[PDB]
Every structure is written in C-alpha cells, then in structure tokens.
Amino acid sequence: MVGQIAKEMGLRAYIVGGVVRDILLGKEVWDVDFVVEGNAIELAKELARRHGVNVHPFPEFGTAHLKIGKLKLEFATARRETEPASLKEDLIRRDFTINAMAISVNLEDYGTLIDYFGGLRDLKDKVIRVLHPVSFIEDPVRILRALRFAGRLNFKLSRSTEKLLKQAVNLGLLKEAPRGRLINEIKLALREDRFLEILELYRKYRVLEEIIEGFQWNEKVLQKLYALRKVVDWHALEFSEERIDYGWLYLLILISNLDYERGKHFLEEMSAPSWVRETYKFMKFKLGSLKEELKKAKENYEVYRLLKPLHTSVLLLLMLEEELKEKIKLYLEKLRKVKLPKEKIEELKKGKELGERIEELKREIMN
RNA sequence: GGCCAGGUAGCUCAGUUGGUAGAGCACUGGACUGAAAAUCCAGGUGUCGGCGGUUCGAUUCCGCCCCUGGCCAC
Numbered sequence: 001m002v003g004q005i006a007k008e009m010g011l012r013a014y015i016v017g018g019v020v021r022d023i024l025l026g027k028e029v030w031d032v033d034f035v036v037e038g039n040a041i042e043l044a045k046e047l048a049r050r051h052g053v054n055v056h057p058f059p060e061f062g063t064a065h066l067k068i069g070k071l072k073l074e075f076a077t078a079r080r081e082t083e084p085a086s087l088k089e090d091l092i093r094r095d096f097t098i099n100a101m102a103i104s105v106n107l108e109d110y111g112t113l114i115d116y117f118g119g120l121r122d123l124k125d126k127v128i129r130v131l132h133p134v135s136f137i138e139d140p141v142r143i144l145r146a147l148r149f150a151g152r153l154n155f156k157l158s159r160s161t162e163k164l165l166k167q168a169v170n171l172g173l174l175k176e177a178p179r180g181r182l183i184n185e186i187k188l189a190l191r192e193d194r195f196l197e198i199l200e201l202y203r204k205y206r207v208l209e210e211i212i213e214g215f216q217w218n219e220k221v222l223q224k225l226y227a228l229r230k231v232v233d234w235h236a237l238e239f240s241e242e243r244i245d246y247g248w249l250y251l252l253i254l255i256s257n258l259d260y261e262r263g264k265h266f267l268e269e270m271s272a273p274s275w276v277r278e279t280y281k282f283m284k285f286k287l288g289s290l291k292e293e294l295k296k297a298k299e300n301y302e303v304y305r306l307l308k309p310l311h312t313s314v315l316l317l318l319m320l321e322e323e324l325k326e327k328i329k330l331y332l333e334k335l336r337k338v339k340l341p342k343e344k345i346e347e348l349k350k351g352k353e354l355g356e357r358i359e360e361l362k363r364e365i366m367n
Numbered sequence: 368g369g370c371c372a373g374g375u376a377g378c379u380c381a382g383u384u385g386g387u388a389g390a391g392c393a394c395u396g397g398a399c400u401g402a403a404a405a406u407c408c409a410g411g412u413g414u415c416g417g418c419g420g421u422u423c424g425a426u427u428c429c430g431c432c433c434c435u436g437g438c439c440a441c
C-alpha cells in the first residue's frame with residue numbers, strides 16, 4: 001500500500017540498507033527501513049491511518065515509526081548528511097556497498113533494485129568494501145562493524161578497505177570514538193553465532209587492545225575460546241532447550257586474565273546480565289577452589305551438592321577441564337534426573353527436616 | 368530497542384543459606400453509645416506483577432511477557 005500512497009502524494013519511497021541486504025541474502029526481517037524523497041512523516045501518518053494503527057512521529061529527526069502486525073516500519077526523509085536530498089546522497093553517507101543499496105516500492109518501477117556503488121557485485125563476491133577512503137575516519141565505530149559483518153556473512157575485506165581500516169586503528173581513532181557506540185557494537189557482536197570469527201578479526205586487527213584497557217592476546221585464552229566453542233556446540237546440541245546467551249561466556253574467557261577492577265568496570269559499561277556478573281565474580285575467585293573440590297570428589301552426592309546450586313554458565317566453564325568434562329556430563333544427562341512414587345513419599349513425610357531426610361534418601365539412592 | 372533498579376495490604380515501606388510472612392493509618396463484627404467517635408478484645412489486613420519450566424515444594428532459580436522510573440543507543 002506504500003507505493004499507492006506514495007503515488008497519491010507524488011513521492012518516491014525506497015527500501016534501504018541492511019534490510020535490502022538481508023532480502024538479497026534471503027533472510028526475512030520484521031524491521032523495514034524506508035527512505036522517502038519528500039516528507040516521510042506524512043507518509044507514515046497516512047499509512048498508519050489507513051491501517052488504523054498508532055504512529056510515532058519524530059519531526060526533528062525527520063523520521064517516523066509505525067507497527068503493523070509483526071512488521072516494524074521506519075520512514076526516514078532523505079538526507080545528504082548525518083535543499084532536498086536525492087536518494088543517492090542518502091545512500092552514499094552509509095558504511096559499506098552491501099548496505100548502500102535500495103529497492104523501489106514505487107508502483108511504476110516496483111521491484112527494482114537500485115545499486116549505485118556496485119554493492120550487488122561485492123555481495124556476490126563476498127566483499128566488505130567502503131564507499132570512500134575517509135569512511136573509517138568519519139565513523140571509527142565502523143571499524144568494528146565491518147569485522148562484525150565479515151564475521152557474520154563470512155565475507156572478506158577488500159585490500160583498499162583493509163588498508164584503510166589498519167590505518168584508522170593505527171591513528172588511535174578507536175580511542176577518540178564515543179565509548180557507548182563501541183560498547184554497543186561489541187554487544188551486537190557477542191549476539192552473533194559466528195561471533196568467534198569476529199573475535200578472530202578483533203585479534204587480527206588488534207582493536208580490543210584499543211577498546212579494552214590492559215587486554216592482551218595469548219594462546220591459552222584462544223584455545224579456551226575454541227574449547228568453549230566445542231562445549232557450546234554440544235550443549236546447544238543435546239541440551240538446546242536449556243540454552244542461554246553463549247557470547248557472554250566468550251567475553252568472560254577474554255577478560256579472565258584481566259584485573260578484577262577493569263573486568264567489573266568493563267562489565268559495568270557493557271550492561272551485562274546479572275548471571276554474567278555472578279559467573280565472573282565466581283570465576284575469578286571461588287572457581288579454583290571449586291575445581292580442587294571436584295578433584296577430591298568420590299561419591300556422586302558430593303558432586304551433586306557442589307554442582308546443583310550453580311548456574312549453567314558455571315558448569316559450561318567447568319567443562320573446559322578435560323578431567324571434569326565427563327563428570328559434568330554425567331551430572332547433566334543422568335545424575336540430577338530422578339523421582340519417587342506416592343506411597344513412599346507419603347511414608348517419608350510421616351519443616352526443613354523433611355528436606356534433610358529427602359537429601360539423605362537421594363544420597364542413599366546415588367551411592 | 369539494551370540495561371539497572373523498583374512491583375509486598377486501600378496507601379506509604381523492610382524481608383536470601385527454598386521450609387508454613389510483617390509495621391504506621393483505613394475493613395468487617397461485637398463489647399461501649401440516645402446516635403457517633405475514641406478506645407479494648409481482637410482478628411480480613413496478601414494466589415508478595417502475569418504466564419510456563421526446574422524442584423517433593425518457588426516471593427527466591429531460570430525463561431517469556433505486563434507496568435513504572437531512570438541511564439542510554441535512538
């Protein structure tokens with residue numbers, strides 16, 4: 001209905017950005033970004049009015065948001081910078097060629113993909129390429145983004161883009177960039193399933209050294225990351241109903257050798273979940289003694305007592321040890337699964353003493 | 368949209384190793400009164416946001432959502 005309203009208003013609207021990319025990548029999303037020549041606000045208001053839904057105008061930004069079903073629609077007036085601006089000017093201010101394309105929703109040309117910079121080719125050639133040499137200097141945050149994209153889509157940086165990125169990092173522009181944008185970029189990164197490769201790119205171009213203070217790369221951490229990769233694979237395979245956020249575990253592995261102050265401060269800046277902070281504070285101190293206790297474990301009930309109160313993250317961190325692996329697994333798919341019939345429990349019940357007795361019965365069954 | 372709190376009676380507020388819930392003023396009833404209030408005995412003072420899951424058992428552990436306030440990314 002967008003093309004119709006755009007025709008009535010004598011306007012030109014286009015689908016724009018990553019939304020197009022995901023479309024060309026076959027990935028359907030519920031968030032659509034529009035660029036409108038002419039007023040986007042009135043377009044959004046009219047579209048929201050016809051479908052009879054609420055509208056959220058932003059006059060100063062020149063954009064408007066409206067939700068139809070599960071579809072989240074954003075209309076944005078064309079602008080040459082972050083006189084009426086052409087679509088091309090609105091596209092050229094963006095980051096990479098694959099994010100620089102557009103698809104026309106106007107009824108006459110409808111279905112047409114508009115690519116000025118050859119983003120279609122780079123998408124076809126699996127290439128992450130900047131629109132202009134000054135791109136990374138304009139927005140240093142993009143330094144992460146590229147890598148992140150190169151992580152997700154398994155693309156490669158062009159020689160140009162790569163040299164420009166290295167030059168950008170060497171200038172220390174990563175420190176000059178706003179802390180919030182970078183931290184948010186990392187938060188976006190860890191949510192990726194391919195985020196490990198993104199970390200490989202972070203190590204390769206050494207951006208984490210700039211972002212995180214006191215952080216350095218070694219082999220033990222990397223091997224820990226790949227071991228954690230395997231553990232995450234298995235856990236998300238068999239136990240997949242129990243899944244949690246995995247990237248935070250990698251993030252914990254990275255900052256493990258860091259001081260507790262810088263770690264707590266970083267997790268503070270990252271707005272990490274509570275279980276993440278707890279798992280970290282537990283890892284830095286009590287984890288060692290916990291492992292030493294698991295080594296002294298003989299009966300299965302001791303393993304129970306030492307494990308069951310812990311979160312899943314702590315267990316997945318305990319699976320990093322070769323000797324404790326099969327033990328953790330044994331606790332997972334077997335040990336903690338059991339029950340009791342009616343009459344027996346009725347005899348068990350005849351306060352906290354009921355719980356103690358039940359514990360005695362469990363340790364009676366195990367061993 | 369991300370996160371941090373906050374969600375406890377009508378209102379204003381505390382509560383951790385999961386194990387049988389609390390204060391200050393309104394609420395009912397009776398004793399009291401010509402009526403009423405005060406006051407005494409007392410006792411409602413609550414599925415401690417909503418829905419699932421784990422657990423013998425969840426205000427607590429976790430997950431998905433509702434609401435309010437604040438940091439932001441917008």
Ligand SMILES: Nc1ccn([C@@H]2O[C@H](COP(=O)(O)OP(=O)(O)OP(=O)(O)O)[C@@H](O)[C@H]2O)c(=O)n1
Nearest residue numbers: 017018019021093094095096099100139141142
């Ligand atoms: N410094 C920046 C940041 C963003 N952009 C452009 O603005 C858009 C911001 O939308 P975003 O959601 O960040 O990009 P997506 O490809 O949609 O990524 P995702 O779908 O993962 O959100 C991007 O497409 C990018 O082309 C840019 O030109 N310069």
